[PDB]
Target: CTD small phosphatase-like protein
Amino acid sequence: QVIPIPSPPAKYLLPEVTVLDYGKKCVVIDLDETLVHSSFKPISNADFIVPVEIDGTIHQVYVLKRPHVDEFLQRMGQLFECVLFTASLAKYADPVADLLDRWGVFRARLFRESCVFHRGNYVKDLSRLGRELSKVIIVDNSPASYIFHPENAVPVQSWFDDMTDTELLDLIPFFEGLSR
Model:
């Protein structure tokens, strides 16, 4: 009581759903190989460059945007409570999301701290979100991420650099139809 006790830990990944989000499915979206592909190998046509300090030293990260990601994120931001959920380091993923999400589309961003190590893999345990599970969808290229919840996952192919990819555009009418 004398001096303030540090903040007591939340029991759920997300806060309670806000007003503008009542009645909306929660869509958990992955970052790496889902929305973008990053390397440390320099390329001339990167979409973003992000400097990341690890162990006191600066790495330049080169980020390519999967085709149609802007249009996809824009429409998802209109229809759902969107949550970025990655097993990537927040020091990397956060500044990337700042450049990618220019429109307040993501209600929340969850990184490595929100993933659990299970038998070689980093799992996104959807029962921890604080949301109705029949009202959660996961958009993620790595089935190992959703090992506990494969019924909530629409299959998403890993994306590296193929500019003919249209999976995010094809996701739009799928998600519109289940917005109903």
